[PDB]
Amino acid sequence: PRLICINDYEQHAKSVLPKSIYDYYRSGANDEETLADNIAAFSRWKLYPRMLRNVAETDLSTSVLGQRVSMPICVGATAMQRMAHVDGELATVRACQSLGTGMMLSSWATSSIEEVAEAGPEALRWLQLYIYKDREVTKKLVRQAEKMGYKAIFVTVDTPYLGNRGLAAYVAKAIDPSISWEDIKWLRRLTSLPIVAKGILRGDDAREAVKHGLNGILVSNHGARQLDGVPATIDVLPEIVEAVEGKVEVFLDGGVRKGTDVLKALALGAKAVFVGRPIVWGLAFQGEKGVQDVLEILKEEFRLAMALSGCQNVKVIDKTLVRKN
Amino acid sequence: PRLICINDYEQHAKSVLPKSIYDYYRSGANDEETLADNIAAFSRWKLYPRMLRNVAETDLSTSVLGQRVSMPICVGATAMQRMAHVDGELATVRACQSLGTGMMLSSWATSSIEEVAEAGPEALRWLQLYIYKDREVTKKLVRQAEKMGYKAIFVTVDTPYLGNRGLAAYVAKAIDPSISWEDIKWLRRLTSLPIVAKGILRGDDAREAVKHGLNGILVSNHGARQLDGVPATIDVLPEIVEAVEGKVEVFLDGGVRKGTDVLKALALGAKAVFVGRPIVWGLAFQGEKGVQDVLEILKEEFRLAMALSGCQNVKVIDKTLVRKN
Amino acid sequence: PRLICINDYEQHAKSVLPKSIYDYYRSGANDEETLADNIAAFSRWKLYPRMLRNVAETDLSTSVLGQRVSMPICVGATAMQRMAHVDGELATVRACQSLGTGMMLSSWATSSIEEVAEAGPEALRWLQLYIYKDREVTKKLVRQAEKMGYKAIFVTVDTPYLGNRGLAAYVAKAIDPSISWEDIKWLRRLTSLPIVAKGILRGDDAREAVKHGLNGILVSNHGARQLDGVPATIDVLPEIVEAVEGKVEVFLDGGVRKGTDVLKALALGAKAVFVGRPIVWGLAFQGEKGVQDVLEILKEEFRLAMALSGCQNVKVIDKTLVRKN
Amino acid sequence: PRLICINDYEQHAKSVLPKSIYDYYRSGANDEETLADNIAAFSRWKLYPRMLRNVAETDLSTSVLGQRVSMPICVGATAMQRMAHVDGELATVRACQSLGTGMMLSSWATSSIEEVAEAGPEALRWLQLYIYKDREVTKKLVRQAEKMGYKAIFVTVDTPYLGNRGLAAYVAKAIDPSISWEDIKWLRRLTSLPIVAKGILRGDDAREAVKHGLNGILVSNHGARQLDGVPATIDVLPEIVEAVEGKVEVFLDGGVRKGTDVLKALALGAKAVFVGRPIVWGLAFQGEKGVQDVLEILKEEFRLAMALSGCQNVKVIDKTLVRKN
Ligand SMILES: CN(Cc1ccc(F)cc1-c1ccc(C(=O)O)c(Cl)c1)C(=O)c1cc2ccc(Cl)cc2[nH]1
Ligand SMILES: CN(Cc1ccc(F)cc1-c1ccc(C(=O)O)c(Cl)c1)C(=O)c1cc2ccc(Cl)cc2[nH]1
Ligand SMILES: CN(Cc1ccc(F)cc1-c1ccc(C(=O)O)c(Cl)c1)C(=O)c1cc2ccc(Cl)cc2[nH]1
Ligand SMILES: CN(Cc1ccc(F)cc1-c1ccc(C(=O)O)c(Cl)c1)C(=O)c1cc2ccc(Cl)cc2[nH]1
Ligand SMILES: Cc1cc2nc3c(=O)[nH]c(=O)nc-3n(C[C@H](O)[C@H](O)[C@H](O)COP(=O)(O)O)c2cc1C
Ligand SMILES: Cc1cc2nc3c(=O)[nH]c(=O)nc-3n(C[C@H](O)[C@H](O)[C@H](O)COP(=O)(O)O)c2cc1C
Ligand SMILES: Cc1cc2nc3c(=O)[nH]c(=O)nc-3n(C[C@H](O)[C@H](O)[C@H](O)COP(=O)(O)O)c2cc1C
Ligand SMILES: Cc1cc2nc3c(=O)[nH]c(=O)nc-3n(C[C@H](O)[C@H](O)[C@H](O)COP(=O)(O)O)c2cc1C
């Protein structure tokens, strides 16, 4: 079928996936108020484009935690990618390598840390981690990330328990509800790799993450799958950027579907954004080629949005490009 | 059928009850503007969860008017529970006893004060009262509550006349439209039991209730069945908490359907919330077991919402967890 | 059929009237934005009821321009009432006489000033006037109102031309687009009867009407049939009440369908409200008896709204009963 | 068919045009958020009409860049008008000549600059220009406008690339993404004709256009066909009027469908407005006569809106006629 935007990929996915699998990937928590708002919030922020700036040579490149990327649009962690396509996380990492962007590998992946590193030897790769009740397993994963050339740890901190959208009983054995800032101190001592706190929604927590020596904040409501009725990530992003006072790089996920979403998040001070569901829809369409397609659509929507806004590169995207109304 | 949230219980009830009985329980007054808003208002208050707090051991227990309860979620007065299930108020009190929460018995109950006390000897039980034109009947009910081990009187003060949603002619003979603060003075002198004013929507009235020696305020619009176009209870709650300056415990009812609703009401300073309609839907499903199910669903939704918000107990639920937008 | 609220009367009218006649009465101007808002605006103003005030003996009576009425709910001018019912304006005046309220007779009535005075000799009656290009006709109507015991002139000032919802060519010959404050000076000199300016939407115009010796302002957008995109009357009412500084009585029409609408308008400082369309729906249902029914439904909805709000009479309806949100 | 407002013309056009052509003319960019808002924004601005002003002799005439026009409603540039009607731009210019208003000829017209000048020798005519990569072509068009009696250049500055709603590859060869304020300096030196910057959405850019010696600003989001998620033109207009401090005439396009839209734009300080799509719907209906019809409907809607607002001419339309709510 002819797919020209990310929503077309989702609609294609709904048509080919078994209902249960599509619903698993689509769903948010409880009444799905935050799921709707992660998208609606982007539409409330309006763009104020500059004219006549010279955008002949647009350059989308940036850096994430000191590593160069082709665009400020990266693949976020999504569990069990082999349910969407046989090649799962291997298809995803190959697409990231082709695009020159980074892949955040899920802790619940249907491919090993080593298998993904060997599929995408030249790809920028990070590991998403939970601090499991079994701290030996946690340490083993960190050491394997270090050995297999992963460049950062994203520690997910918003899942002491799973959100309500016996598989959950199996995950309950793994996920530690007792995790505190003391366990973040332990993780910080365990590795010299950059660590990003994923799932922060409050400025005071972002300040605590900086105080604990972490290297970034991913402003995330876990794709609206954890606590329902939290705000949209794009709405909390300004408070978090303000709170960290430039000490660490702030990222965003939740609701990114269009190039204008990327532009609004960078205008409000995010270094880069991550996409979850759109990658899964790419896999459902055509594995590696479908992920490549989704990433290329986001890249060229972002390039156009930058050019129409008068931005020849990401360094000139400033706060006056957006206002909420 | 498979019912996992309170809305599923309502939909089941609509399917099994005669239309007239379902509509009687569902309805609000006039155009039902307040009925819609009691629910919509909860969705406008957004949650700002703290991460990494240690929520392994969540404790939902609290106290209502000095009596310990298992959770800050209690059964509100709803007339004529035997229309939903043969066991009516006896089923409800048995479920409350099982849960360790309190039951507010309606003045228009299809079970006697004594019958309910003997069904739930160990249950925490309160009596909801009107000051009837017949003050002898009113005094007899208070004395029977005292003798049968009820722990408080909830005096409903928002029904001088019934709201417009010859049965009403029968109730018109009972309900006194002349009640004033002088009649509250009389009730306060009549009993040493704690008295809660149920149906206050204004700070100045809440202050008057404190001045009259009452022991609590239940912020209530009578489930949107009295005056239509009053605000949602969750929207007036902050003014009332502010007005009473900590002198008495403030409760809320109206629109509570989810654990996140409970969390938002406690964040804004309510000690506990009451549920009306959800209990009737529980009865319609399966009597005592259906009421137990609804109360358990609200308990575990509330536990999850607390844990995801970083609250290990009700004492740490604070105003920074919510903001209206 | 069983009709319990004003909307039921409209739905009955749609069912019995020819489509063209129903649409003529229903319609507003252009895209009907103001028609929708005259109703929606009432729902945004929320009521803050006082409890425990003693409302056993509710008294709805008030006065309009020094004449006592049974309720602050009066019949507004609506052209060509004989299209709805054979008895037209005679049915309406008989119903007003039964209710003890006033009737504003249209300048475009299907009954003469004398015929209406003889149908309702004891009814409170006012004449709605245009200053026609033919000033002799205008003066003749005023003199006939004086002689036939009408108690005030309502001069409609918002129709220099008809709004866009060869009949209009006939009315174009009559209606003078040149009318200015100089013509108001002329009308003020012509009669000692109270004169009300009908169709004011701005405080500065209300102040000018006071300066010209007029005796009241009817805040009106002509039932949303003139300029579309003006505000709802309930939203402009506070500015107009503020502007006239108590010098003259301020009335409202536009969108009044319920007793709570009446209560909100009096809380914001209107002395009384007028109803247009609801009267026409009453006529379409059953002539005089249908108008009586509509007026009785508005009376008893208003009584209930007053009693539930803690108001035993109109003199205690105050601004703290309403807030916009 | 019977067409009484601009929306009726669009609905007629949808019925007669091939779907692809209707969709080409209708569409906006991406999710069409700005397309919806260009219309919705007009409805949020409310009118505050003055009564009793004397509007017998309404005069709609004004001037655009020193040239008298019959009304402050002018034809904006729309490419390839021959797809709607065989007579295309020749039909449009003949209608403008009949009305006494101006036509802005598209750079992508299906009629030559000379052909349009000879169809409408007496019509007020302007040329819309791009600064093409081929600056010789650009200069040739300007010289031909000068020679063929066009009175101004509208330089479109919001299209460095086409918005996303191999034809685009053909236009990509022409449209220069490198254009800067240096190229505006060049154009200003090239011609003594008035130059208007079309597509400005920011006050700082409007100030820069004034500094560069341009003679007007057309506040435009290119009919919501360029960057999606910019604000509605009526919402940015006040900032732009404020920013230029009366130095140049400010115009508006985007979403004008009704006479009240024209009145709101002039109240907020626009000298005149331009219409795009409505003209194309006129052509689709009946060529020159259909364009004349649309312009006459906008003229007489505007006259009525002015008269009902108490404005006898455009010079008395002031900012107190509008407020946003
Ligand atoms: C609990 N759970 C998900 C699950 C099962 C197994 C597993 F090993 C990990 C997880 C898991 C996934 C994500 C995250 C996170 O981080 O978002 C975490 Cl914590 C844990 C399920 O219930 C579940 C999986 C699933 C697959 C297909 C279908 Cl049709 C339905 C499904 N439901
Ligand atoms: C008046 N009324 C309710 C009613 C009838 C009898 C009674 F003894 C008490 C009441 C009563 C109920 C609640 C409250 C309160 O506090 O909310 C008060 Cl004040 C009084 C009815 O009209 C009514 C009951 C009813 C039952 C089934 C169906 Cl299908 C329709 C019904 N309508
Ligand atoms: C102009 N007009 C109305 C009209 C025609 C005749 C007349 F003598 C007075 C008027 C008139 C009415 C109200 C007002 C006012 O004050 O609101 C004023 Cl100014 C003048 C019509 O077009 C019209 C009437 C009518 C009847 C039935 C149907 Cl189905 C359609 C209809 N259309
Ligand atoms: C690019 N484009 C439009 C196009 C093709 C050719 C041309 F010479 C000019 C243009 C053009 C039009 C407007 C503007 C502007 O200013 O808004 C600019 Cl820059 C350039 C198309 O894709 C296109 C045209 C068209 C016609 C019919 C149908 Cl059904 C579909 C269509 N699509
Ligand atoms: C199906 C699914 C699986 C997810 N699995 C994980 C996971 O294993 N680890 C994790 O930290 N987050 C996980 N997330 C959250 C994502 O990392 C990301 O925060 C979210 O998808 C971003 O929102 P978006 O889907 O709107 O782009 C998952 C999200 C979805 C939809
Ligand atoms: C069917 C029904 C019957 C009610 N009966 C009573 C009653 O007898 N006494 C009383 O004080 N309130 C009564 N109420 C109001 C409730 O105590 C409570 O304020 C309301 O149900 C709370 O809103 P909720 O239904 O949204 O939870 C009733 C409410 C309903 C829906
Ligand atoms: C069908 C119709 C006819 C009207 N005719 C007149 C009239 O003859 N004179 C006048 O001053 N206003 C007239 N009005 C305006 C009314 O007096 C009144 O302002 C309006 O109906 C109030 O709004 P409502 O219909 O929502 O109650 C008319 C309104 C309608 C709907
Ligand atoms: C079909 C179409 C073609 C257009 N072509 C041009 C063009 O050739 N040059 C240009 O400067 N703007 C062009 N525009 C933008 C218009 O000049 C104008 O800004 C826009 O139509 C105004 O919004 P409206 O259509 O809501 O009235 C076009 C707009 C449409 C809808």
XYZ file of C-alpha atoms in Angstrom, chain B residues 3-316:
314
model
C -15.504 -6.645 34.191
C -12.113 -5.033 34.945
C -13.044 -1.373 35.725
C -16.023 0.476 37.234
C -17.326 1.589 33.760
C -17.585 -2.169 32.827
C -19.854 -2.678 35.919
C -22.110 0.210 34.792
C -22.338 -1.254 31.256
C -23.177 -4.694 32.740
C -25.858 -3.052 34.966
C -27.454 -1.275 31.927
C -27.633 -4.734 30.242
C -29.379 -6.567 33.183
C -31.547 -3.856 34.926
C -34.953 -2.766 33.612
C -34.397 0.560 31.683
C -36.499 2.580 34.243
C -34.341 1.342 37.232
C -30.990 1.820 35.372
C -32.140 5.343 34.349
C -33.258 6.118 37.975
C -29.748 5.246 39.281
C -27.811 6.844 36.340
C -29.677 10.155 36.017
C -28.715 13.635 37.161
C -30.860 16.756 37.288
C -32.240 18.697 34.267
C -29.703 18.755 31.323
C -27.134 16.677 33.401
C -24.350 19.294 32.962
C -22.971 18.670 36.480
C -23.308 14.855 36.002
C -20.908 15.068 32.979
C -18.609 17.557 34.786
C -18.161 15.450 37.999
C -16.275 12.993 35.690
C -14.706 15.510 33.175
C -13.269 17.657 36.013
C -11.125 14.733 37.312
C -9.506 14.430 33.835
C -8.472 18.169 33.858
C -6.409 17.708 37.056
C -3.073 16.216 35.925
C -0.732 14.072 38.051
C 2.960 14.905 38.593
C 4.465 11.635 39.868
C 7.697 11.338 41.893
C 10.135 8.609 40.793
C 12.544 6.428 42.808
C 10.791 6.747 46.208
C 10.595 3.021 47.351
C 6.964 1.865 46.998
C 7.533 -1.867 47.775
C 5.257 -1.769 50.814
C 2.245 0.431 49.964
C -0.093 1.101 52.905
C -3.541 2.448 51.956
C -4.900 2.627 55.563
C -6.168 5.906 57.022
C -8.789 7.090 59.513
C -12.223 8.700 59.079
C -13.469 10.725 62.126
C -10.996 8.814 64.393
C -11.934 5.268 63.162
C -9.288 3.271 61.210
C -10.183 2.165 57.634
C -8.307 -0.083 55.120
C -8.402 2.589 52.391
C -9.623 6.177 51.891
C -12.535 4.866 49.774
C -15.924 4.467 51.531
C -19.517 3.595 50.542
C -21.830 6.632 50.212
C -25.617 6.678 50.917
C -27.752 5.495 47.944
C -31.519 4.973 48.486
C -33.359 1.684 47.836
C -30.471 -0.722 47.164
C -32.982 -3.670 47.094
C -34.089 -2.464 43.598
C -30.583 -3.502 42.339
C -30.257 -6.802 44.299
C -32.516 -8.788 46.724
C -29.893 -8.496 49.582
C -29.661 -4.654 49.074
C -27.991 -2.826 52.039
C -27.204 -6.154 53.786
C -25.012 -7.201 50.785
C -23.329 -3.741 50.895
C -22.509 -3.819 54.641
C -21.130 -7.404 54.372
C -18.790 -6.236 51.527
C -17.643 -3.219 53.617
C -16.901 -5.544 56.561
C -14.787 -7.808 54.238
C -12.872 -4.764 52.832
C -12.341 -3.017 56.228
C -14.010 0.207 54.978
C -17.104 2.147 56.149
C -20.705 2.196 54.938
C -22.921 5.323 55.027
C -26.502 3.985 55.346
C -29.170 5.997 53.434
C -32.175 7.543 55.248
C -34.289 5.873 52.468
C -32.852 2.352 52.881
C -34.755 -0.928 52.059
C -33.175 -2.394 55.316
C -33.566 -1.093 58.920
C -30.748 0.476 61.018
C -30.903 -2.645 63.240
C -30.913 -5.170 60.279
C -27.780 -3.508 58.775
C -25.972 -3.444 62.198
C -26.720 -7.210 62.648
C -25.563 -8.043 59.005
C -22.291 -6.092 59.642
C -21.656 -6.151 63.407
C -17.861 -5.565 62.901
C -18.268 -3.126 59.910
C -17.643 0.631 60.351
C -21.155 2.116 59.887
C -22.505 5.671 59.706
C -26.055 6.945 59.304
C -27.048 9.503 56.688
C -29.884 11.675 58.042
C -32.320 14.351 56.898
C -33.858 16.732 59.461
C -37.458 15.698 58.657
C -40.503 17.935 59.295
C -41.246 15.267 61.956
C -38.395 15.972 64.390
C -39.515 13.010 66.619
C -38.677 10.559 63.723
C -35.360 12.404 63.214
C -34.447 12.034 66.921
C -35.565 8.321 66.917
C -33.194 7.585 63.973
C -30.230 9.325 65.765
C -30.928 7.370 69.014
C -31.166 4.055 67.043
C -27.802 4.877 65.290
C -26.225 5.499 68.739
C -27.687 2.256 70.219
C -26.765 0.069 67.150
C -23.066 1.134 67.203
C -23.027 3.615 64.216
C -19.983 5.969 64.580
C -21.228 9.205 62.922
C -24.194 11.096 61.490
C -23.959 12.524 57.940
C -26.675 15.239 57.781
C -27.609 15.906 54.126
C -28.104 19.700 53.756
C -28.518 20.211 49.928
C -32.097 18.784 49.582
C -34.706 21.284 50.908
C -36.673 19.963 47.858
C -35.878 17.104 45.451
C -34.029 17.982 42.222
C -35.894 17.583 38.870
C -34.496 14.491 37.038
C -46.550 10.973 43.192
C -43.455 9.380 44.868
C -42.015 12.981 45.148
C -45.297 14.058 46.933
C -44.658 11.284 49.564
C -41.017 12.526 50.091
C -42.238 16.206 50.120
C -44.255 15.303 53.295
C -40.980 14.150 54.962
C -38.227 16.570 53.755
C -38.329 19.976 55.554
C -37.524 22.953 53.227
C -37.355 25.289 56.305
C -34.111 23.767 57.749
C -31.583 26.454 58.829
C -28.388 26.683 60.862
C -30.733 26.861 63.952
C -31.774 23.228 63.165
C -28.057 22.274 62.879
C -27.604 23.757 66.416
C -30.456 21.442 67.562
C -28.894 18.367 65.948
C -25.454 19.186 67.443
C -27.107 19.315 70.969
C -29.085 16.056 70.289
C -26.022 13.695 69.961
C -22.316 13.489 70.944
C -21.634 11.396 67.766
C -19.473 13.086 65.109
C -21.681 14.983 62.632
C -20.634 15.631 59.001
C -22.436 18.256 56.813
C -23.059 16.525 53.450
C -23.683 18.674 50.352
C -21.612 21.838 51.049
C -20.239 23.584 47.925
C -19.151 27.000 49.327
C -16.254 27.966 51.645
C -18.465 30.373 53.673
C -20.966 27.522 54.411
C -18.031 25.211 55.342
C -16.825 27.869 57.816
C -20.372 28.121 59.288
C -20.460 24.296 59.748
C -17.156 24.488 61.711
C -18.556 27.385 63.802
C -21.643 25.170 64.633
C -19.379 22.433 66.091
C -19.743 19.906 63.247
C -16.819 17.445 62.800
C -16.477 17.187 59.015
C -17.597 18.471 55.596
C -18.569 16.070 52.739
C -18.079 18.181 49.563
C -20.946 16.820 47.469
C -23.395 17.913 44.743
C -25.567 14.866 45.627
C -24.212 12.949 42.578
C -25.402 15.880 40.325
C -29.069 15.023 41.200
C -30.014 18.332 42.982
C -29.093 21.742 41.421
C -27.687 21.331 37.865
C -24.896 23.690 36.840
C -23.037 23.632 40.146
C -19.345 22.865 39.752
C -17.743 19.434 39.906
C -16.887 18.468 43.508
C -13.166 18.046 42.671
C -13.134 21.714 41.466
C -14.726 23.163 44.669
C -12.711 20.872 47.043
C -9.599 23.191 47.200
C -11.698 26.256 48.263
C -13.424 24.183 51.027
C -10.110 22.682 52.335
C -8.658 26.253 52.390
C -11.748 27.633 54.162
C -11.793 25.092 57.076
C -8.085 25.743 57.955
C -7.586 22.104 59.148
C -10.311 22.382 61.856
C -12.336 19.383 60.480
C -11.792 16.501 57.990
C -13.034 17.246 54.426
C -14.378 14.375 52.283
C -15.535 14.257 48.641
C -18.075 12.382 46.549
C -19.274 12.853 42.977
C -17.666 11.241 39.946
C -15.132 8.887 41.695
C -14.671 5.946 39.246
C -10.873 5.249 39.287
C -7.934 4.995 41.654
C -6.423 8.154 40.088
C -9.628 10.040 41.111
C -9.019 9.001 44.751
C -5.340 10.092 44.501
C -6.287 13.541 43.028
C -8.924 14.166 45.798
C -6.392 13.272 48.592
C -3.692 15.452 46.888
C -6.161 18.414 47.081
C -6.683 17.714 50.807
C -9.656 15.323 51.164
C -9.219 12.730 53.949
C -11.286 10.167 52.031
C -13.817 9.842 49.205
C -17.248 8.187 48.987
C -18.712 6.311 46.029
C -22.432 6.177 45.186
C -23.358 4.729 41.799
C -20.390 2.262 41.537
C -21.779 0.332 44.599
C -25.244 0.065 42.965
C -23.606 -1.320 39.793
C -21.728 -3.881 42.023
C -25.083 -4.946 43.582
C -26.713 -5.221 40.103
C -23.839 -7.551 38.985
C -23.742 -9.937 41.982
C -24.945 -8.514 45.300
C -22.329 -8.716 48.089
C -19.663 -10.265 45.784
C -20.276 -7.523 43.118
C -19.902 -4.730 45.781
C -16.726 -6.476 47.060
C -15.401 -6.614 43.437
C -16.025 -2.857 42.834
C -14.379 -1.917 46.172
C -11.374 -4.235 45.418
C -10.980 -2.695 41.894
C -10.979 0.836 43.406
C -8.540 -0.336 46.170
C -5.991 -1.854 43.733
C -6.357 1.004 41.165
C -5.639 3.398 44.072
C -2.664 1.302 45.286
C -1.162 1.319 41.757
C -1.768 5.095 41.313
C -0.099 5.749 44.716
C 2.912 3.483 43.870
C 3.401 4.996 40.375
C 3.232 8.495 41.975
C 5.962 7.605 44.520
C 3.641 7.459 47.595
C 4.200 4.528 50.000
C 1.295 5.717 52.279
C -1.505 8.343 52.342
C 0.446 10.674 54.679
C 2.950 11.552 51.863
